[PDB]
Ligand binder design. Structure first.
Ligand SMILES: [Zn+2]
Ligand SMILES: [Zn+2]
Ligand SMILES: [Zn+2]
Ligand SMILES: [Zn+2]
Lengths: 58, 82, 381
């Protein structure tokens, strides 16, 4: 599991699908899971517009 | 509303992902979930009703319980911030 | 039969450095007035469980023999002072550690190394360790006593909820029936019921086995009383007020009833029934206490969603409560993977057979047992 250095999206791929950055770090921390963006308070505080695996400390 | 949910040792990230499986795929209105690395054996679940949480965790391995009460959003911002 | 180095200054069991040829008290720092008392291992062991039970067996001498034992509640300072180590690792030996086994705690296997004393496995009385508790936890033995004190004393200021008029007459009434135990308790219950029915400073309370509340209105919102509130609330009560309750200013401060430091028994008290070895019940719960205690400290030092701390704090309380008394009313008994319930402290110090209720009343009142006229040979002289 590698988390992106800009948007924070944790992905298994060679690139973050949401944006498409090749910059993926291994030493990441604090998992955040998103189901809904519009209703969830969590997405608002961080600023994530796409549901799925996001990170905090990279 | 944020509901604190008990989890087994290390099983934080795994049960956090596992709970996400019974959400839309079963028709359960969970908004979000928080699995912070500095938190030991507990998971936050953003849900509207108490039934929503109870229904999600039910039948989920290594996800022991659900806390009596609700966690105020202000107490949760800290982990999300860093 | 075992020789025990007892401190003359403070009645505590002094250390004998076999390696450095040094006999001294760890608690009051005494180095001269310390005597060697002949004793049955039975009774050295008995003293040592009492200590691990947060009870302070203050030893008073006569002649090179114990004249009497004053009962009391061990102070965190004492518990910390008498400790040889701060226990940190919830691990058995795997074969020795930095946790529950000889981390300067006592030798029991062919590895003679110790707490400077370096005395061989073959005769080295263990030394107490200590766990520093992430949050205070109620000493189960004193729960009902705390309840009484809590309901009989005022919040914010801490007075005995009696008019200075009442105190003048009652303290005088106590002095009269101070010697006679049964009528002193007849007066203790009277004071309580009389201050329990008062509500003006010159809310109510609920229980079991360690849970306390205060019913407040806005609507019966029952506010739960947490050990830090209960502890600090009790640290207030002046020494002046203490005799209008069971407690003694020197021997048993009310605050000492909510644990801040839990003594870890010496290794000699907790032997494994070796063959994968049959680790002693007291060591198992001690692993479980540390296990949670570090998990608490972790979530305290990290983010505090409080609902979590509460859940963990309540669990640390549980573990301490079962360790103190597994046969406790309102306590689901801790069992090992088989269903057989653990046999802990209260289970040990009761068959020297001892009825625990009595122990606590002793420590509460600061009772002095004497060992002199119709002598007990089962404890050597
Ligand atoms: Zn990206
Ligand atoms: Zn001393
Ligand atoms: Zn030793
Ligand atoms: Zn008052």
């Amino acid at each position: 599991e590698k988390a992106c250095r800009h948007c924070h999206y944790i992905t298994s791929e060679d690139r973050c699908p949401v944006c498409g950055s090749r910059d993926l770090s291994e030493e990441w921390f604090d998992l955040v899971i998103i189901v809904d963006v519009e209703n969830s308070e969590i997405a608002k505080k961080i600023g994530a517009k796409v549901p799925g695996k996001y990170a905090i400390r990279v | 509303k944020i509901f604190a949910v008990r989890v087994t040792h290390g099983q934080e990230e795994t049960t956090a992902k596992l709970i996400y499986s019974k959400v839309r795929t079963y028709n359960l209105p969970i908004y979000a979930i928080l699995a912070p690395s500095r938190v030991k054996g507990y998971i936050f679940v953003e849900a509207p009703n108490k039934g929503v949480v109870d229904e999600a965790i039910r039948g989920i391995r290594h996800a022991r319980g659900v806390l009596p009460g609700e966690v105020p959003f202000k107490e949760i911002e800290h982990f999300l911030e860093e | 039969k075992t020789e025990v180095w007892v401190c003359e200054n403070c009645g505590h069991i002094a250390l004998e450095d076999k390696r450095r040829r040094r006999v001294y008290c760890p608690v009051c720092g005494e180095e001269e007035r310390i005597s060697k008392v002949e004793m049955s291992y039975a009774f050295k062991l008995l003293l040592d469980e009492l200590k691990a039970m947060v009870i302070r067996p203050k030893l008073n001498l006569s002649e090179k023999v114990i004249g009497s034992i004053e009962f009391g509640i061990l102070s965190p300072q004492e518990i910390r002072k008498m400790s040889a180590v701060e226990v940190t690792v919830p691990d058995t030996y795997d074969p020795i550690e930095g946790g529950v086994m000889d981390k300067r705690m006592g030798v029991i296997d062919p590895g003679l190394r110790c707490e400077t004393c370096g005395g061989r496995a073959g005769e080295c009385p263990g030394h107490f360790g200590h766990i520093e508790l992430a949050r205070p936890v109620i000493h189960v033995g004193f729960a009902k006593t705390i309840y009484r004190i809590l309901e009989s004393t005022c919040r914010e200021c801490g007075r005995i909820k009696l008019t200075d008029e009442e105190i003048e007459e009652y303290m005088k009434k106590i002095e009269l029936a101070r010697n006679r135990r049964s009528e002193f308790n007849e007066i203790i219950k009277e004071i309580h019921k009389k201050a329990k029915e008062r509500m003006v400073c010159p809310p109510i309370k609920f229980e079991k086995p360690t849970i306390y509340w205060e019913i407040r209105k806005d609507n019966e919102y029952r506010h739960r009383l947490m050990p830090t509130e209960v502890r600090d609330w009790l640290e207030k009560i002046p020494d002046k007020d203490l005799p209008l309750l069971g407690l003694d200013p020197e021997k048993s401060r009310p605050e000492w009833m909510v644990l801040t430091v839990l003594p870890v028994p010496p290794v000699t008290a907790r032997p494994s029934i070796t063959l994968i070895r049959a680790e002693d019940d007291l060591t198992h719960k001690l692993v479980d206490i540390i296990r949670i205690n570090n998990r608490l400290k972790q979530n305290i030092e990290a983010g505090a969603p409080q609902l979590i701390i509460e859940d963990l704090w309540d669990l640390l309380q549980y573990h301490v409560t079962t360790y103190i008394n597994n046969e406790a009313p309102g306590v689901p008994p801790a069992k090992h993977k088989s269903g057989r319930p653990l046999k802990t402290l209260a289970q040990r110090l009761k068959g020297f057979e001892i009825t625990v209720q009595h122990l606590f009343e002793a420590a509460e009142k600061g009772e002095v047992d004497n060992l002199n006229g119709v002598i007990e040979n089962v404890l050597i002289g």
